[PDB]
Design a protein around this ligand. Sequence first.
Ligand code: HEC
Ligand code: HEC
Ligand code: HEC
Ligand code: HEC
Ligand SMILES: [Ca+2]
Ligand SMILES: [Ca+2]
Ligand SMILES: [Ca+2]
Ligand SMILES: [Ca+2]
Ligand SMILES: [Cl-]
Ligand SMILES: [Cl-]
Ligand SMILES: [Xe]
Ligand SMILES: [Xe]
Ligand SMILES: [Xe]
Ligand SMILES: [Zn+2]
Ligand SMILES: [Zn+2]
Lengths: 770, 768
Amino acid sequence: EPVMTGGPVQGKALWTDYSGMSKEVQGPVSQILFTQSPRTAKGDPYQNYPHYIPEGSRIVLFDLNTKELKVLTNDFATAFDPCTYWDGKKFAFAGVHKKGGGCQIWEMNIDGSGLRQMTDLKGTCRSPIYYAAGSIEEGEGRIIWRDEGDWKEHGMVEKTGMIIFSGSPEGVMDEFHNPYAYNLYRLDTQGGKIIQRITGHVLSGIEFPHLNTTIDQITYNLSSNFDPWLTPDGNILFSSVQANGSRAGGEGRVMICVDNWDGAYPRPIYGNCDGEIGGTSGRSQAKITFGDRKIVYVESPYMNWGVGQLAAVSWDAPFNKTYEKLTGKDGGLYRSPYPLPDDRMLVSYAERGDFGIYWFNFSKCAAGDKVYDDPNWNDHQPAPVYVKYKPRWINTFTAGKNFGVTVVTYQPFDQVKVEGYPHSWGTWICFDTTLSDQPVGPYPHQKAKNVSHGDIKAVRIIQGYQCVEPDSTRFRVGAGAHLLGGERSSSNSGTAFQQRGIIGYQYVESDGSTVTSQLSDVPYYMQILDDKGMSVQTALTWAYLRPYHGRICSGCHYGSYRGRAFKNIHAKALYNWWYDDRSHYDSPFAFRYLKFDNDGNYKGVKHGEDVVGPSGTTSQPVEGLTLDKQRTVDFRRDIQPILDAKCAMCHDSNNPPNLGGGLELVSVDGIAAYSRAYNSLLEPQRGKDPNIGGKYVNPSAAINSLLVWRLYEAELSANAPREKIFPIEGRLLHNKFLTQDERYAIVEWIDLGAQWDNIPGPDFYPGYLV
Amino acid sequence: EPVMTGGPVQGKALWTDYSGMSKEVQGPVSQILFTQSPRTAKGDPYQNYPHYIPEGSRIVLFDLNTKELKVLTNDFATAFDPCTYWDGKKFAFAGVHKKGGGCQIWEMNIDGSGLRQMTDLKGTCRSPIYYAAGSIEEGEGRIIWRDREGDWKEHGMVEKTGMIIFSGSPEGVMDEFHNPYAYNLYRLDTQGGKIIQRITGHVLSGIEFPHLNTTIDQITYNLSSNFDPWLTPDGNILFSSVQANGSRAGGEGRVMICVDNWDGAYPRPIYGNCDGEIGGTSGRSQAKITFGDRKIVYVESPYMNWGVGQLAAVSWDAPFNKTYEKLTGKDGGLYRSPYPLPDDRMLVSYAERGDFGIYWFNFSKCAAGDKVYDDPNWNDHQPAPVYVKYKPRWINTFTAGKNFGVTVVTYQPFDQVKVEGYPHSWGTWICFDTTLSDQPVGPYPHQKAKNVSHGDIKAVRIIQGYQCVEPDSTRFRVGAGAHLLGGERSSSNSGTAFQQRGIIGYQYVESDGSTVTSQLSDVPYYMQILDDKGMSVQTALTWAYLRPYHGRICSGCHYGSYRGRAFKNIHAKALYNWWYDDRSHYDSPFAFRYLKFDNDGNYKGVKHGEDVVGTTSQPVEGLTLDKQRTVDFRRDIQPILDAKCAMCHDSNNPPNLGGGLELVSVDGIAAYSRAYNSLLEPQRGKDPNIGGKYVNPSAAINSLLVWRLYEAELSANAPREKIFPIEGRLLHNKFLTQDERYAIVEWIDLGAQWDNIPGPDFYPGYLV
Ligand code: HEC
Ligand code: HEC
Ligand code: HEC
Ligand code: HEC
Ligand SMILES: [Ca+2]
Ligand SMILES: [Ca+2]
Ligand SMILES: [Ca+2]
Ligand SMILES: [Ca+2]
Ligand SMILES: [Cl-]
Ligand SMILES: [Cl-]
Ligand SMILES: [Xe]
Ligand SMILES: [Xe]
Ligand SMILES: [Xe]
Ligand SMILES: [Zn+2]
Ligand SMILES: [Zn+2]
């Protein structure tokens, strides 16, 4: 039947309609594949979701007729996450082999034969799915490329598809300090020659020669991205954890979103914004119905749980008006929903707690007739066999790591090894930086004051540093529990903000437009700045650019990437982007420093000492591509000496705050992490949300910080830190105590999240030791 | 061991120390009682909590040693909620017998003999506990009273079994979530009223069960469910209360841990109901207190109506955020029904994957410890270990139950209705400062619409809530106002989350901000402070109740005097207006029916009604339930709109007030008129709980409509960015008289309902 569009004949859908032809191409379903896990904390660790390794689990095939069941995975100690191929005669999954090798991606046919190992990766791998690019019809396809030059066929490749999966390295911590950080990877199954078929060059990334496969990382988020799936328009639907800093009451949120299979254009779908339903509930295992086009997902009571109730929001219009509750009146737990083109669904359901496979009933808003339920197994992840129609494959302008593809001749190129760049780079542009749907408020993701065109002088670009602490004696979690951070603090910072550094600064045009070139394949976010160089509004999220890629946005959280059409805007920055035919991008790279006038106003942007094979492929000087020399503000190395020199003299235990004591660690509740000055400055204030700030300090807002208010001796923002600020008796002007560099160093420190240890891993600077 | 205080000897505790004496009197634990439930949605309906009737369940006795189990409940169709007596040789529970009779309260010896039915009620009964009042020691107490101007003499004696506090719901009622149950706490005389007669000198007033030789009295009048009562160290009742009132708590509501006296004289919050606290909308149930470190331990469910979930704890001595802990506390499963022992051990009902069992708790590993007993075919919960319980101190009661007070002078019981001649039970309350609050200036109804000082608050509006009762199923529909502000909690009666209400009356406020008044007793109520225009500046969202003859004091308006702070020392004018006369119970003025204003509509004074009827020196007013005034949109507002508004307001000139009382179909539901739908319409970028375009429920002063009717800026909260148009402006202040305008004001402050008359009536409404 036709769904999205009309067909050539009444009763039949056009070939451009995915959900319409998945109807017809499906075919009868006699058989189903599903995962059986032992019932144990460690047998079914859904509480650790996305990081899920149901040790001792098997993937099994059950036919709905004779009702036989066969175990395909018997060679594996652990097996889970079944995903069927297009024809339905084979599937891919995640497993731990009895011979070892860790938890990796595997694939085998439906009969149990043809076992092949996809991933040798060091880390954990799960959630494989088939996204076929350049492969529609079954067969072989041609590899063509260019050498004055021509386009020649160099021979062929079997066209099967690509594998999109979630994976995480080891010795890594997320923003919740869990010992995993997941992300999305695209995998060439032919050894990189499918990418070479599409792009004209083999996939760049981590290579697995012995397995004849290649992997590339399409999502750089510092927290876990997981459960990838297919959108009707041919993109990747998945779940993303945004924990960044104090965002969303400090507990962050798990959103359903989509991204291109090369990770070129990630955008939110539902759950990440204020006003939206579900709060801190976890959203996982999201799939889309064919008939009514609804995104159906598991809504877990707890953020990290993989089981819960069933929620739905229309894919066409993902808003609160289309939200609905599919379950919850039987008090049972649901997981792993699987919509069918027949407008049926297979759900894993535990009424009183024994999980089994059941047909879903939409009329009863609950689980229907039983398929297969073993009392000795949690039966979940149903994956029925049938012919799946194939989503559209979008053109990729990246060959993967360090590799871009020209927009002119479409020729793959390596920015590092060949062109001589220190690191792969890309661009981004905002048409209006003063344009927002956010009001003026105390919270860092809001405006600290009204800003018009010309009010925003420049922008700060910050790169998130992953938290890696191999030595457990040099790192402790919850050392700042008495401070603003709470349980999300650590030996590194007294706030919820983890270690990060400055990518660099970029000026803003008078109309509020800005554009810049910067590092790629790295997590980053940005802050709009006033004439004093302080952040008015902070973007709390993790953005990433693929090599040579660039990204546009209408405004600052204006909704252009969420719920609203692009506003038509003619911007100055557009003419600063690429004007030269011999260049990839003519847009300026992020500047390292700032220059101010005598009054402390913003004079402009200043170059650093990192300037750079290299080729002539850009007009502007190359700055900030060296990861080694990237600058950050560390409290011990930078701020503390300033405090000792210009402050601690008049500030002791008798004159709060107490800045004395130097770098000597102060024991709090049996934990010695930071010094006296840090503990003093990060101290909470009664009646104030610590997610906003403390007495003297507001993380990621300098303009809202009482300390900065006093250092500039003025009221900087529309949010007052407290009722009485400037004493009417015995007041002392603090504005002349510091130079501009020191004061703005403090400003930068606060805007960075006011950390303590900003240098990843154990270093020589004072800190937690046992 | 000494806990709260030092004892007579080192290592031993004073008898005044409840925790310590509980430690010393406990003894070794051998046998335990617990509930086994069938595993089904119908067999274990913990999603319907507080309303829980695990049909098919049984109560069993298990030996921790010989490991042999026995079913004591075999004669019952369903049994649950076991609670052991002080000696531990008998226990009380809830359930329905095979002979029928419904779900009731029973008690039985733990050997399985001596069954007795403590309750025969129309409704459902749950979670009985023993509260020993007048009985510390085993034996017979003597009954003594005054001879009606004679001496005090002894009449008879009574076996002292104490009393029984339980939670129960009537038949055919709806809560504020439109669930078909409303739970409240009841005290029960085990001896048939003569325990109360021993304490008071008159038998317990309330519903009598002469066949069971028992009597019950309702101690909590909250419109939503109060459930799972327990014992505090200081001798009060600890339980969970549902505060759903109106649009409060983001239109959701909260389940709070709170305490009250066994007669319900002094309800106060412990933890969970206030902004800035932890757990949000999480359900809080089955709370108990640890003996050693004195910590309240409760089940925190992710869903408000769920009875299973995690385990959290807060200090009893200091119930604040700083003392909040999450006991369990990670992987992988669910917890329910914790039971802290005096020896600091604990029994929890734990499900690792899917099925609950009895487990010792491990505080070091923050999870379930060694296994006690689990059947795979049963869900094993509600552990009730057998040991000796130390009796908490019993507090003096000044009420004999319904209509009955007890004087503070001679201490003799008196009936306010049958004898003294009052139409209804009446208590008093006093606030020393109505301008004193911990709340900031904000758009939400529980906050201040504007800054107010002494003298700025002229009077107060006292509002009685009406239980939602709809016998006819054809004339009532839930979710009729889904397109309006109410959302899912709306109905045929209201387009808001506010259910049906009425005005108890107005009371003036002294220049120092103090106020005192006499009003109805044993009815749910709350109040609003009013400015010189008679509009609510701040609304108290909760259900207060007064027992007969009982006064209730508070320092301020949500100031912390009843929550987190000490009473503020205040010398108030209202204090002298309370009781000055020898011949009177209370000399405080009753709530006035109306308010009278000046020419422009500013507050002049309070005006008596026609409901005015020698134990008080003031006119008795507002004690007649049938005469209680409310504001109905159809009867009161809509006519005014038709006469003075609908004229030039049509589809072309929004809002559209035309069409009269004719119903409008929205999403296939015909509930309200055109004017109601128009005025209750939501606004983009505005929290529906705050209000809509023209109407903010329970704030008139924040409403755009009222802003235009007075043609002025009323509050510090702007309804929208552009209020008054620049061109084409027309002044609306002269269109209405003060009566009509303030009628609209009253309508909005009441929650802006549609049907304010409970049950099916003759006025237009939903019909199918
Ligand atoms: C009976 C007392 C009423 C009520 C309750 C309202 N009106 Fe009127 N109205 C008229 C005109 C020309 C306007 C627009 C110009 C202006 O607002 O000054 C209005 C506007 C309103 C509003 C505001 C709507 C909004 O801003 O969105 C409201 C809430 C309102 N009205 C209610 C004209 C008349 C009129 C003569 C033609 C009469 C009589 C009324 N209105 C009566 C009433
Ligand atoms: C002696 C000349 C001082 C030097 C050197 C520094 N401060 Fe100071 N500070 C001093 C006084 C006498 C006071 C009293 C209050 C006032 O406003 O004069 C303060 C106060 C502060 C405060 C405000 C504390 C509060 O309001 O709670 C802050 C935030 C502060 N001081 C910080 C500060 C810094 C960063 C300094 C180094 C540049 C510093 N002080 C030096 C006296 C003296
Ligand atoms: C002003 C600062 C900006 C600018 C210039 C951009 N964004 Fe956006 N962004 C911003 C805020 C305040 C937030 C929410 C922060 C919070 O919730 O605490 C976001 C969020 C995002 C997200 C996450 C999904 C969402 O919230 O919608 C993405 C993805 C995102 N922003 C992308 C994005 C793009 C493509 C931009 C063009 C350069 C862009 N941001 C600019 C604020 C700001
Ligand atoms: C000003 C209006 C008052 C006055 C004069 C009193 N109370 Fe209190 N009340 C008030 C507010 C704003 C709230 C919270 C509303 C919300 O939505 O959260 C309350 C609530 C209560 C409660 C519930 C527990 C709690 O929130 O702490 C109780 C119990 C309570 N109020 C009792 C009470 C008493 C005994 C008073 C003395 C007469 C009293 N209130 C006065 C606002 C106000
Ligand atoms: Ca099973
Ligand atoms: Ca470090
Ligand atoms: Ca069991
Ligand atoms: Ca009615
Ligand atoms: Cl935007
Ligand atoms: Cl108070
Ligand atoms: Xe269509
Ligand atoms: Xe961003
Ligand atoms: Xe109240
Ligand atoms: Zn957002
Ligand atoms: Zn409160």
